[PDB]
Structure 1
Amino acid sequence: SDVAIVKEGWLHKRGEYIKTWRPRYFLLKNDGTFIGYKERPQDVEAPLNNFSVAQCQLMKTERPRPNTFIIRCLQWTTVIERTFHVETPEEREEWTTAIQTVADGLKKRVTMNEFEYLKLLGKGTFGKVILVKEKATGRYYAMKILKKEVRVLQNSRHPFLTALKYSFQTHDRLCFVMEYANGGELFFHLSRERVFSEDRARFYGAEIVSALDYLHSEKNVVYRDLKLENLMLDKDGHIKITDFGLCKEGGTPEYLAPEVLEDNDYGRAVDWWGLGVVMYEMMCGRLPFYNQDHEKLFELILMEEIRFPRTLGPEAKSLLSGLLKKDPKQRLGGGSEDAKEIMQHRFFAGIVWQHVYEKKLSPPFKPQVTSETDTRYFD
């Protein structure tokens, strides 16, 4: 089959970090990609699953605004919600029908008592994340509990991604049990050490690049939430990117790519931005931007630029400068090569990437834990 546009038109998308409604031109192709653009798209990339309407339920409501239709999608272990608004009810119905057609057209023992519930890691609209301990193994896991109302496919394993081990559902809930690293939060390590050495950051940076490459080329998904808070270390001291994300309703926007703040089309380059912010904090001991006013913090990320400390090396300068480019098309890793643009960078000279993936590179830091069951970083 050939990928063509099923329906295109102007919609009013609710901003994901801005309560306001925003005029965006959306394209609905038969591959399932529902992407919206600030202006009518240039007639001139690879398919990302972030925008796929596959396995999504459409809900038409009149709140908080009349003629509203909501797409609700289960992506990996996180329910995402995208709210849209049209002017006439007839437009909504031909939009939902079009999307429902493509969505359907793309079809082509374990219980709660087995775990011990120590800490609430996060709460959200469609569920919560809880730090649990399996009674039998004595091991620590993160359980992602989602509302049910809202096949072992574990070839999704990767050394630097929190593994989704299994999935079970209770009466009215769907629970995702996943690995929880006990090497402590990385921000807790960074703040404790104030700043990472340039080579140490290289290590953490390399392992993230490996994982991002994996998500982009194999899984064709964008992580989109690459921040310091979402990075942990395992007992060995290697990076684990978490998957504890939840939708919430009603500083925080610092880790956000400019195109994401402007609710434009975003792609893989967003993760490289995220990567830039993280590696900036590791080598500088400070976020790129800080100011309190959300309108000023937004404009900081949108138009103001990033100063570099003279303590920083020139190779790190070129890397952060490229990673933290305002325009995703000019951004390092933003072209077709993706992660290859970043892996070939001089900051990562002498770093062989097959070895990073096989954890051959010796960690520059070893967490103070005898075992995975060591609760030294939880207390």
Structure 2
Amino acid sequence: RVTMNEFEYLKLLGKGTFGKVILVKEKATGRYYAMKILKKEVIVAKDEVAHTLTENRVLQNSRHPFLTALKYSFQTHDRLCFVMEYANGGELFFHLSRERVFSEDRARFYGAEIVSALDYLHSEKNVVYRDLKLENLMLDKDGHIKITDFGLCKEGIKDGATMKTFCGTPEYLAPEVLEDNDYGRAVDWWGLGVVMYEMMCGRLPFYNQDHEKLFELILMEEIRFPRTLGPEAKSLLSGLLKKDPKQRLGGGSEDAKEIMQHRFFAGIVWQHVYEKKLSPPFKPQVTSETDTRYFDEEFTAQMITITPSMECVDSERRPHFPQFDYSASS
């Protein structure tokens, strides 16, 4: 039976719109985790309840080498706590920022891992991820991808079933989402297109600081590439960033298999991707189990405290949530 008292709170790893993530040590075991901490009050007030419960569900129901693994979820009278594996390599942005562009080989390696994870979610879990953006990609201590943040997932989506919720970050929205006339699972391949584009090209495929103008570009503007980009990369990215999901790579009944067989991935053995038999091109150079070199000092410098008999309280501002009683089976 796990509570807040079972952990030592070490360093702030980041803050998002709805809460914060702390590097913790489980005292009993000496193991290190990233604890995501949400205020019930804030979740309720910002209408983030449904997303939070979706994230909780999808984490409990999924086991994949490239999806962040949940160890515990539990709740206090005022908090919801996700204890997850600590992705020691930080956010991919940290790296991509600094290096400007990844090589095609390194993007290919990350792209394959992301395809592997999305194929599992689509094929095995009937889940559409919907939130594929650079910010949701981290690296584990070995340099393998971890997709994080499952709040915008859609469950129970089998084959060609459609969704209609308008959601996702403005720069990353697929044309059919902006059309707002229903969309399907190929929205994830649009997202793979955008992140692989950022990795290889060093910038978003489409950008304007005005959203109306950004949305016009996403919908209408043909993709362009820096002229150093190799032909196969350009072919992959053009196929992923087709405006019409029916013409998009991965947009047909074969889903991920169409992307897996693209010649950009020639020579990749997909079972070996899954088994982590491809050596990462970058290994995080962390020197301890608590090294936070791949996290922003803006966050890690900050002080941590217990806030910034109530076991059964179930109020409107602070509900007693279902399924926050989770400890992964050993």
Q: TM-score band (shorter)? A: 0.7 to 0.9
Q: More displaced, 163-172 or 302-311?
A: 163-172
- Tell me the SS of whatever aligns to 2:57: coil
Q: What percent of counterpart residues are identical?
A: 99
**How many correspondences in the alignment?**
268
The farther-off stretch of 316-325 and 128-137 is 128-137
Distance 1:266 1:150, change over 3 A: same
Offset at residue 129 of structure 1 (A): 4.9
CA distance in 1 between counterparts of 2:177 and 2:280 reads 33
Cα gap change, 1:192/1:263 in structure 2, threshold over 3 Å: closer, same or farther? same
Residue segments in structure 2 that go unaligned for 5+ positions in a row: 41-54, 156-167, 294-329
Structural mapping, 1:155-234, within 5 Å: 156-234=62-140
Deviation at 1:178, TM superposition (A): 1.4
SS in 2 for 1:177: strand
- Cα offset, 1:282, TM superposition: 0.8
Structure 2 equivalent of residue 351 of structure 1: 268
**Distance change in 2, residues 1:137/1:260 (3 Å):** farther
1:316–1:116 Cα change, 3 Å? same
Contact kept? 2:129, 2:153, Cα under 8 Å = no
Report the TM-score when normalising by structure 1: 0.63
2:131/2:153 contact within 8 Å kept: no
How much does 1:118 deviate?
5.1
In 2, the alpha carbon distance for the partners of 1:366 and 1:122 equals 22
| Counterparts in 2 of 1:116 and 1:196: CA distance versus 1, 3 Å | same
Q: Indicate conservation of the 8 Å contact 1:235/1:372, yes or no.
A: no
Q: What CA distance in whole angstroms lies between the structure 1 residues aligned with 2:17 and 2:280?
A: 38
Task: Point out the more displaced range, 111-120 or 184-193.
Answer: 111-120
Determine helix, strand or coil for the equivalent of 1:166: strand
Tell me, in whole angstroms, the C-alpha distance in 1 between the residues paired with 2:129 and 2:75. Answer: 25
Is the contact between residue 119 and residue 131 of structure 1 (CA under 8 Å) also seen in structure 2?
yes
Change (3 A) 1:331 1:113: same
Give the superposition deviation at 1:293.
1.3
Name whichever structure is richer in strand by fraction: 1
Q: CA deviation at 1:119?
A: 5.9
Matched position secondary structure for 2:198 = helix
Distance 2:246 2:176 in 1: 11
- Contact 1:124–1:246 (CA under 8 A) maintained in structure 2: no
Looking at structure 2, the residues matched to 150 and 353 of structure 1 have their Cα atoms a distance apart, in angstroms, of: 28
Alpha-carbon separation, structure 2, partners of 1:185 and 1:141: 16
Verify the 8 A CA contact 2:141 2:283 in the aligned structure 1.
yes
User: What is the deviation of 1:227?
Assistant: 0.8
Structure 1: runs of 5+ lacking an equivalent: 1-108
Tell me by how many angstroms 1:115 deviates: 2.5
TM-superposed CA distance for 1:229, in Å, is 0.8
Alpha-carbon deviations, 1:240-289, whole Å to 9, x = none?
1112758999x951111122223332221111111000000111111111
Deviations 1:314-344 (A, max 9, x none): 1111100110111111111011110001001
| Two-structure CA RMSD over aligned residues (Å) | 4.0
After superposition, what is the alpha-carbon deviation per residue over 1:156-205, rounded to whole angstroms, capped at 9, x for unaligned?
21111100112222234432221220112211111111111111110000
Rate the CA distance shift 1:213–1:151 in 2: closer, same or farther, 3 A.
closer
Contact 2:198 2:204 in 1 (8 A): yes
Distance 1:235 1:257, change over 3 A: same
Question: How many Å apart are 1:228 and its aligned residue?
Answer: 0.8
Distance 2:13 2:215 in 1: 27
- Structure having the higher Rg: 1
Shift of 1:147: 6.2
Higher mean C-alpha deviation, range 297-306 or range 172-181: 172-181
Q: Deviations over 1:106-163 (max 9, x none)?
A: xxx2111222445666778876655544344454433344566999995621111100
Q: 1:205·1:279 contact (CA, 8 Å) conserved in 2?
A: yes
Report if the CA contact (8 A) 1:181-1:372 is conserved.
no
Contact map agreement 2:129 2:150 (CA 8 A) in 1:
no
Q: Distance in 1 between matches of 2:208 and 2:91?
A: 24
User: Is the Cα contact below 8 Å between 2:129 and 2:154 reproduced in 1?
Assistant: no
Maintained 8 Å contact 1:332/1:342: yes
Distance 1:229 1:371 in 2: 24
Is the contact made by 1:289 and 1:301 (CA closer than 8 Å) also made in structure 2?
Answer: yes
Q: How far 1:290 sits from its partner (Å)?
A: 1.9
**Given the superposition, is the C-alpha separation of residues 127 and 232 from structure 1 closer, same or farther in structure 2, using an over 3 Å criterion?**
closer
Q: Is the 8 A contact 1:207 1:239 kept in 2?
A: yes
Distance, in Å, in 1 between the alignment partners of 2:14 and 2:292 is 19
Contact 1:126 1:247 in 2 (8 A): no
